Design a protein around this motif. Structure first.
Motif, short mmCIF file in Angstrom:
data_model
loop_
_atom_site.label_atom_id
_atom_site.label_comp_id
_atom_site.label_asym_id
_atom_site.label_seq_id
_atom_site.Cartn_x
_atom_site.Cartn_y
_atom_site.Cartn_z
N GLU B 301 0.79 -1.13 -0.11
CA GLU B 301 -0.16 0.01 -0.06
C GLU B 301 1.00 1.32 0.06
O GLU B 301 1.54 1.45 0.97
CB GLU B 301 -0.93 0.08 1.32
N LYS B 302 0.86 2.02 -1.21
CA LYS B 302 1.62 3.08 -1.28
C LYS B 302 3.19 2.74 -1.18
O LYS B 302 4.07 3.76 -0.94
CB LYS B 302 1.36 4.34 -0.27
N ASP B 303 3.43 1.45 -1.49
CA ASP B 303 4.77 1.06 -1.48
C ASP B 303 5.41 1.35 -0.03
O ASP B 303 6.59 1.55 0.21
CB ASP B 303 5.90 1.53 -2.40
N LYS B 304 4.58 1.33 0.95
CA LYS B 304 5.11 1.62 2.40
C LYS B 304 4.06 0.84 3.44
O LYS B 304 2.78 0.61 3.17
CB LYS B 304 4.81 2.96 2.67
N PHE B 305 4.79 0.29 4.69
CA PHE B 305 3.88 -0.56 5.44
C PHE B 305 4.63 0.10 7.01
O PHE B 305 5.82 0.40 7.07
CB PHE B 305 4.31 -1.91 5.29
N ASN B 306 3.88 0.07 7.99
CA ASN B 306 4.15 0.40 9.52
C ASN B 306 4.61 1.88 9.34
O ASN B 306 5.94 2.06 10.01
CB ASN B 306 4.97 -0.58 9.92
N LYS B 307 4.25 2.84 8.49
CA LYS B 307 4.54 4.08 8.28
C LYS B 307 6.36 4.03 7.86
O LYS B 307 6.82 4.94 8.26
CB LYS B 307 4.18 4.79 9.70
N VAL B 308 6.51 2.82 7.02
CA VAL B 308 7.90 2.81 6.54
C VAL B 308 7.76 2.45 5.00
O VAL B 308 7.18 1.44 4.70
CB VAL B 308 8.60 2.01 7.35
N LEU B 309 8.31 3.31 4.14
CA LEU B 309 8.36 2.92 2.69
C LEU B 309 9.31 1.85 2.28
O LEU B 309 10.48 2.55 2.18
CB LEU B 309 8.72 4.33 1.86
N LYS B 376 13.48 0.65 8.40
CA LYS B 376 13.19 -0.20 7.24
C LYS B 376 13.18 -1.57 7.55
O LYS B 376 12.22 -2.31 7.05
CB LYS B 376 14.33 0.05 6.25
N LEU B 377 14.22 -2.07 8.43
CA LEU B 377 14.17 -3.51 8.48
C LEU B 377 12.93 -3.95 9.21
O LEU B 377 12.45 -4.97 8.95
CB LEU B 377 15.26 -4.11 9.22
N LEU B 378 12.60 -3.53 10.33
CA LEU B 378 11.75 -3.76 11.06
C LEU B 378 10.24 -3.80 10.55
O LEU B 378 9.49 -4.45 10.94
CB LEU B 378 11.65 -3.18 12.69
N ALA B 379 10.14 -2.73 9.76
CA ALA B 379 9.01 -2.55 8.92
C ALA B 379 8.82 -3.83 8.00
O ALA B 379 7.57 -4.34 7.71
CB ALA B 379 8.85 -1.31 8.29
N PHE B 380 9.95 -4.37 7.37
CA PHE B 380 9.73 -5.35 6.62
C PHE B 380 9.32 -6.50 7.29
O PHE B 380 8.48 -7.22 6.50
CB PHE B 380 11.15 -5.52 5.95
N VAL B 381 9.95 -7.06 8.38
CA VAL B 381 9.51 -8.29 9.08
C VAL B 381 8.11 -8.11 9.53
O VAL B 381 7.51 -9.17 9.77
CB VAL B 381 10.49 -8.65 9.95
N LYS B 382 7.73 -6.98 10.16
CA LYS B 382 6.44 -6.79 10.54
C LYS B 382 5.38 -7.23 9.32
O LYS B 382 4.27 -7.76 9.70
CB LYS B 382 6.29 -5.31 10.94
N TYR B 383 5.56 -6.84 8.06
CA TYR B 383 4.89 -7.09 6.96
C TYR B 383 4.79 -8.64 7.01
O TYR B 383 3.71 -9.35 6.48
CB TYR B 383 5.27 -6.58 5.86
N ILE B 403 8.44 -17.90 14.46
CA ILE B 403 9.68 -17.25 14.82
C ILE B 403 9.34 -15.79 15.15
O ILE B 403 8.44 -15.15 14.33
CB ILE B 403 10.66 -17.11 13.56
N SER B 404 9.93 -15.41 16.25
CA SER B 404 9.69 -13.90 16.62
C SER B 404 9.74 -12.84 15.73
O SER B 404 10.67 -12.76 15.08
CB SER B 404 10.40 -13.74 17.90
N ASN B 405 8.55 -12.31 15.64
CA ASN B 405 8.56 -11.32 14.35
C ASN B 405 9.26 -9.72 14.88
O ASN B 405 9.65 -8.94 14.14
CB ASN B 405 7.09 -10.78 14.12
N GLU B 406 9.40 -9.83 16.18
CA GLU B 406 10.34 -8.78 16.63
C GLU B 406 11.92 -9.22 16.72
O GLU B 406 12.18 -10.19 17.33
CB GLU B 406 9.96 -8.53 17.97
N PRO B 407 12.86 -8.30 16.64
CA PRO B 407 14.29 -8.68 16.69
C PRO B 407 14.66 -8.97 18.28
O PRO B 407 14.10 -8.36 19.10
CB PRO B 407 15.03 -7.45 16.04
N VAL B 408 15.65 -9.58 18.31
CA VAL B 408 16.34 -9.89 19.55
C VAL B 408 16.98 -8.51 19.95
O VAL B 408 17.50 -7.78 19.25
CB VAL B 408 17.51 -10.95 19.48
N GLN B 409 16.54 -8.32 21.27
CA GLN B 409 17.36 -6.89 21.77
C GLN B 409 18.33 -7.07 22.78
O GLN B 409 18.21 -8.04 23.77
CB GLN B 409 16.01 -6.14 22.48
#
Ligand SMILES: [Mg+2]
Lengths: 452, 419
Positions: B301-309, B376-383, B403-409
RNA sequence: UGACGGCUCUAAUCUAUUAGU
DNA sequence: ACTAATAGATTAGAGCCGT
C-alpha cells in the motif's frame, strides 16, 4: 535481554610517559614517544611533482584548519607536533622526465610495462643512495597520475619488494593527493574533496613520514607482559599459500617491539590456508627466538591470532616446538558474521567498545562504531562487529577481548582513532602483499618501515 | 597589575614538566613567569624573583616533587609566597601541583600540607584539566593572543576523559530468535519409493535425502500428490528424532552425528523460509552467494508499511529494501534477517547490470542512517508477521516453525552524548 | 598508493550425502 | 580411490563508492 560488556579503551604512550586514547591528541598535546633530529626529503618525480611536494611540505609546517575543528582535531604543524624539522628546501630531487614515461608507457606487454616503470623509479633511488653523499631519510615518490591507471603485477607492490634488498624507506604519494585542489573531473570540483579533512590528511602523511624516518610517534602499554602477540595471514599465489607473521610484545623496559617475523611459508596443498608441520615449526621457532633475544627469557604464553582457524597437525607442530611453561592461545578474528545492533532511539551508531560474550570461548567485539572523543565516526553506517573465538588453548574470553582491542592501536600507516581489525593482522597482510610481489628474498627486513 | 602565574620547581629535572606546563598556559593566554624561561641573563634573580612574587604574581603554582620540597631555593619562593598570600587575603593562591609518583601527601611541608593539591601523578592532561577548573573558578583573567589556538587547545584539554555515560541503552539487532519448532525430526526412507535423483527441492515441504533417508519434520504421508505411492510407505522405516535433543547437542547417534543434524536443520530452515516467501509472494533476487527478497512496486500500500516505505525510488530506478534471512543454531537458534537495497528502473525488473546496481546501492546507502536502517528492517519483517507476535514456517502438514517477528534486543550499560 | 570503512562480484577449499568412473 | 551433484560452512580475492 542479552547484556553487552564494555571494553575500556587501552592507552597509547607518548612523550614523558603521558597517556592519551587518541594518537591525534597525545601527539598534539604531548608529542612523539621518541624524537628524531629531522627528516631529509628525497623526491623522485617530474618538475610538476617537485613543486607540489615543496608546496605541501611547506604548507604543513604551519597549523592547518579544517571546517569541522570541533570533531576531528586540527593539525598544529609538523615541527609543532613532532619537534623535528621537515624542510622542503633540503630536497635531494631526482628528476624523472615526463617523456621518459611515454616510451615505457607504449610497451605492448603489461609485464614489461609495470616492470620498467618500477625499474625507472627504484634505479634512480638506488643510484642516488650509492653515488650521492646526501643522507636521504625517506624517499618520496610523487608518481604522476598516468602511472596509476595506464599501468593497470601492481606498480606499488612491485616497487616496495624490489627495494627490500637495499633497505630504503619510501613513501609513495600520488600527485592527485598532494595537489587535490588542482585535479578535477571536468566539473570544477576536486576528484576527491579533502577540504574538510585537511588536518586528517596532514596528520596521516606526517606520522607516516615521521615513522619511516626512524621516529616512534606512539607505543602501546596496555598489554599483558610476557606475551608474544603473533598474527598470521595467508596470501593466495597463482595453488600456493604464503603465511607471513607479525609479532608485538613488550621488552624488559616496557617497550613494544612491533616487528615482523616473516617469510613465504608455502602451502602447495589442496587444502588451503593451513601450514605443514615443517613450515609451521619454523614460523613459531622464529618468533620464539626473536622474543628470546629481545628479552632473554622465553614467553610464558604465545597469543597466536589469525583470520583462519587452525587444524590439529599445525597446532601439534606448535606444541612440539613450544618450550615448557609457555601457553598457546589461538584466536580467530573474522569480519563476516552479520550482527547489526541498531540503536533504539537516535542517529549515531553503536559506540565502539561494546562486546557481546557469546560464550566462554567466543565473543562479538565492536572495534568500529561511534567514537565519542572524535565526535565523528570513522565509519558512516551501522558497523559490523568482529567475531573473536578462542580456537585453541586456555585463555579468558574477557582478557582476550581487551588484548584484541589493544592491538588495534598500533596503526602507523594512519593516525586514526583505531583500526577495525587488529593491526598485526593488517600489517602482516601488507607484508605478504609486498614480499610475494617479486622474487623470493633470502631474508626480508623486519622493520615495517620498508613495507607500510 | 598582578596578572602573572608564577611557577616554582626544582632546577634540573622539573624543567621538562614545567616547560610543557608553561607553554600550555601561555597558549591558553595565561601570563606565566618561569625561573628559566622568562629570567633575563645577568639579572639579580632573587631581586626579580622576590619582586615579582610580591608584585607580579596573581597565582602561585608549585611543581611539587620529592626534590622540589627538599630544594632550598624553592622553599624560599614558597616562604615569600605565603607572605604575599596573607596580604592578598586570597587563600586560593598557592596550588601545589603534585607530579611525583612516590610523593603521597605524607612528606609534604606543613606550609602546603594544609592546601589542596592538583594531581598530576597519573596523567598530566587530566591534572591540567583540574587546574583549568581551578583557575576559571577563581576568574583568573587571561589574554587572547591567538584566539583560535586558545579555544582549540582548551577543547583538547576539556574533552580528554568524557563521553562514556553509565546510562543504559537498548539495541535492536537483525537477529530474530525462533519461537517454535517441530518436536520430532523424521528420516523418511522414501528411497524404495523415490525416483532416481528425484529433485527434493520441488517438494512442497523441505526434505533432505540424508544417505537414503529424506530428513524432514514433515509428516510421512504428506507428499501424496507430489510423490506417488506416498501412502504405500510404511511408517516403521521412518526414524523419529527429538528435535530439542539435537539442539541441546546430545543426540550423538552412530547413524548420524549431532553436528550434521543441525546443518540439515539450517538447510531445512533456510529452504522453509524460501518456501514461505512464495506463499507471501515476495519478488526474489539472485545474489553473488545468497537469495534476495522484496516487494514489487504497487504490491504494498503506497509501497509503504508500518509508516515505513519498504519500496522507494532513486535516480531513474526504484530502490527496494532487500532482505536475505539466514539460519543459525549456535548457541541460540536465530534466523538473521539482513538489509539490502535493490533497484528497478520500471519498479519491476531489476537493473541487470551489476555495476549499476552496486553503484546505486552505495548512493542510496549514504542517505539512510542507523535509525533509518532500523525502521526499514523492522517494518519489513512486520509485514511478514503471520501472527501478531511471530511468523510461522510450514515444514509439514501439521508441523510449523513460529519465529519472533520482533528482533532480539541487546542491552548495554554504557552510552554517549549522542549529539 | 594519505587513509579508513562499507559493499559488490567471483572463486576456491573443508564437511556431509548420493551418483558416476 | 578418482570426478560429478545438492547443500552449509569458511576462506580468499577482485572489484566498485563512500568518509
Ligand atoms: Mg603508507
Amino acid at each position: 535481554m542479552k547484556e553487552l560488556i564494555y571494553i575500556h579503551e587501552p592507552n597509547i604512550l607518548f612523550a614523558n610517559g603521558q597517556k592519551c586514547a587518541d594518537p591525534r591528541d597525545g601527539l598534539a598535546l604531548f608529542g612523539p614517544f621518541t624524537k628524531i633530529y629531522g627528516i631529509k626529503s628525497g623526491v623522485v618525480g617530474t618538475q610538476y611533482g617537485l613543486s607540489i611536494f615543496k608546496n605541501y611540505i611547506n604548507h604543513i609546517q604551519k597549523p592547518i584548519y579544517n571546517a569541522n575543528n570541533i570533531t576531528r582535531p586540527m593539525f598544529p604543524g609538523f615541527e609543532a607536533v613532532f619537534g623535528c624539522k621537515w624542510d622542503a628546501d633540503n630536497v635531494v630531487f631526482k628528476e624523472v622526465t615526463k617523456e621518459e614515461i611515454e616510451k615505457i608507457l607504449y610497451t605492448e606487454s603489461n609485464h614489461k610495462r609495470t616492470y620498467d616503470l618500477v625499474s625507472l623509479f627504484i634505479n634512480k633511488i638506488i643510484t642516488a643512495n650509492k653515488n650521492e653523499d646526501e643522507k636521504v631519510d625517506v624517499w618520496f615518490l610523487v608518481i604522476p597520475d598516468e602511472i596509476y591507471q595506464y599501468c593497470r603485477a601492481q606498480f606499488h607492490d612491485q616497487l616496495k619488494a624490489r627495494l627490500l634488498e637495499h633497505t630504503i624507506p619510501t613513501q609513495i604519494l600520488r600527485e592527485s593527493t598532494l595537489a587535490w585542489r588542482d585535479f578535477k573531473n571536468k566539473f570544477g570540483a576536486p576528484k576527491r574533496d579533502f577540504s574538510k579533512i585537511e588536518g586528517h590528511l596532514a596528520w596521516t602523511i606526517s606520522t607516516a613520514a615521521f615513522y619511516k624516518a626512524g621516529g616512534k610517534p606512539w607505543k602501546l602499554s596496555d598489554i599483558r607482559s610476557g606475551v608474544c602477540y603473533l598474527g598470521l595471514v595467508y596470501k593466495q599465489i597463482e595453488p600456493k599459500n604464503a603465511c607471513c607473521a607479525a609479532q608485538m610484545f613488550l621488552d624488559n623496559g616496557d617497550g613494544t617491539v612491533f616487528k615482523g617475523e616473516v617469510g613465504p611459508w608455502y602451502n602447495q596443498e589442496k587444502h588451503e590456508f593451513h601450514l605443514n608441520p615443517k613450515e609451521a615449526k619454523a614460523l613459531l621457532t622464529q618468533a620464539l627466538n626473536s622474543y628470546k633475544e629481545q628479552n632473554g627469557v622465553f614467553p610464558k604464553e604465545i597469543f597466536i591470532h589469525a583470520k583462519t582457524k587452525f587444524n590439529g597437525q599445525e597446532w601439534n607442530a606448535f606444541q612440539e616446538v613450544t618450550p615448557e611453561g609457555t601457553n598457546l592461545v589461538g584466536v580467530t578474528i573474522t569480519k563476516t558474521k552479520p550482527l547489526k545492533l541498531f540503536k533504539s532511539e537516535g542517529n549515531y551508531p553503536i559506540m565502539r567498545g561494546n562486546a557481546f560474550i557469546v560464550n566462554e570461548r567466543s565473543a562479538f567485539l565492536w572495534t568500529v562504531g561511534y567514537v565519542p572523543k572524535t565526535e565523528s565516526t570513522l565509519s558512516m553506517e551501522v558497523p559490523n562487529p568482529i567475531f573473536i573465538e578462542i580456537n585453541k588453548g586456555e585463555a579468558d574470553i574477557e582478557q582476550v577481548l581487551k588484548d584484541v582491542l589493544a592491538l588495534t592501536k598500533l596503526n602507523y600507516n594512519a593516525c586514526i582513532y583505531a583500526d577495525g581489525v587488529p593491526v598485526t593482522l593488517r600489517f602482516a597482510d601488507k607484508i605478504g602483499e609486498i614480499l610475494t610481489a617479486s622474487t623470493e628474498l633470502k631474508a626480508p627486513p623486519l622493520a615495517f618501515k620498508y613495507y607500510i | 597589575a598582578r596578572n602573572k602565574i608564577f611557577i616554582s620547581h626544582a632546577a634540573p629535572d622539573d624543567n621538562d614538566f614545567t616547560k610543557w606546563l608553561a607553554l600550555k598556559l601561555i597558549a591558553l593566554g595565561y601570563e606565566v613567569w618561569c625561573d628559566v624561561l622568562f629570567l633575563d641573563k645577568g639579572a639579580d634573580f632573587w631581586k626579580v624573583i622576590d619582586k615579582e612574587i610580591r608584585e607580579g604574581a596573581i597565582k602561585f603554582l608549585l611543581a611539587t616533587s620529592e626534590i622540589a620540597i627538599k630544594r632550598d631555593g624553592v622553599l624560599k619562593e614558597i616562604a615569600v609566597a605565603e607572605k604575599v598570600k596573607k596580604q592578598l587575603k586570597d587563600d586560593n593562591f598557592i596550588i601545589p601541583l603534585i607530579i611525583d609518583e612516590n610523593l603521597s601527601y605524607d612528606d609534604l611541608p606543613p606550609e602546603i600540607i594544609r592546601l589542596n593539591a592538583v594531581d598530576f601523578k597519573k596523567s598530566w592532561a587530566v591534572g591540567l584539566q583540574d587546574l583549568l577548573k581551578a583557575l576559571d573558578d577563581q576568574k583568573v583573567e587571561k589574554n587572547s593572543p591567538d584566539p583560535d589556538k586558545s579555544n582549540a587547545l582548551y577543547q583538547q584539554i576539556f574533552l580528554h576523559n568524557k563521553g562514556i555515560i553509565e546510562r543504559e541503552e537498548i539495541y535492536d539487532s537483525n537477529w530474530f530468535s525462533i519461537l517454535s519448532f517441530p518436536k520430532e525430526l523424521r528420516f523418511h526412507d522414501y528411497e524404495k519409493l523415490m525416483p532416481k535423483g528425484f529433485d527434493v527441492r520441488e517438494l512442497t515441504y523441505p526434505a533432505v535425502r540424508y544417505k537414503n533417508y529424506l530428513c524432514t519434520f514433515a509428516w510421512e504421508y504428506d507428499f501424496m500428490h507430489q510423490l506417488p505411492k506416498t501412502e504405500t510407505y510404511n511408517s516403521s522405516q521412518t526414524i523419529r528424532i527429538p528435535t530439542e535433543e539435537i539442539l541441546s547437542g546430545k543426540y550423538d547417534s552412530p547413524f548420524i552425528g549431532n553436528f550434521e543434524c543441525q546443518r540439515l536443520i539450517v538447510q531445512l530452515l533456510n529452504k522453509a523460509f524460501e518456501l514461505r516467501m512464495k506463499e507471501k509472494g515476495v519478488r526474489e533476487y539472485p545474489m553473488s552467494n545468497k537469495m534476495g527478497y522484496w516487494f514489487e512496486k504497487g504490491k504494498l500500500e503506497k509501497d509503504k508499511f508500518n509508516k515505513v516505505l519498504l519500496v522507494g525510488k532513486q535516480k531513474d530506478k526504484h530502490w527496494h529494501f532487500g532482505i536475505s534471512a539466514a539460519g543459525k543454531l549456535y548457541p541460540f537458534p536465530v534466523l538473521m534477517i539482513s538489509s539490502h537495497i535493490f533497484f528497478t528502473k520500471d519498479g519491476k525488473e531489476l537493473i541487470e547490470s551489476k555495476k549499476i546496481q552496486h553503484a546505486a546501492r552505495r548512493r542510496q546507502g549514504k542517505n539512510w542512517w542507523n535509525d533509518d536502517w532500523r525502521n526499514k528492517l523492522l517494518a519489513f519483517v512486520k509485514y511478514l508477521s503471520d501472527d501478531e507476535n511471530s511468523f510461522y514456517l510450514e515444514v509439514g502438514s501439521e508441523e510449523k516453525i513460529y519465529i519472533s517477528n520482533e528482533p532480539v534486543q541487546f542491552v548495554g550499560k554504557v552510552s554517549y552524548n549522542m549529539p
